[PDB]
């Protein structure tokens, strides 16, 4: 549904994963930062699109980026 993209400006601060309320983001190993980890979005079909990860990203400009695309019953947040 929603497309969440991680860019190489990430410092591995992990707070995009901690702010995620639908378990989209996970921290995979990486070689481009001091923390040696970058975020990724394997369960991007579960993304509501709330951009809590973009609110918690301290990198200017943002490393996690959520693009609101086709919206399904996962990304609409319904219970009915």
């Amino acid at each position: 549904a929603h497309s969440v993209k991680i860019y190489d400006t990430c410092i591995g601060c992990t707070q995009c994963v901690r702010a995620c309320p639908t378990d989209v983001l996970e921290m995979v190993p990486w070689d481009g930062c001091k923390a040696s980890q970058i975020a990724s979005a394997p369960r991007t079909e579960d993304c509501v699109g709330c951009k809590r990860c973009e609110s918690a990203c301290p990198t200017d400009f943002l490393s996690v980026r959520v693009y609101l695309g086709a919206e399904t019953t996962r990304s609409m947040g319904l219970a009915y």
Partner: peptide, 22 residues
Amino acid sequence: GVRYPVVVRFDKVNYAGVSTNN
């Protein structure tokens, strides 16, 4: 292997309130 190694501190914050960026 680090893409953005230089850590620069600024006197003014951005809209996120931070001043530290790589």
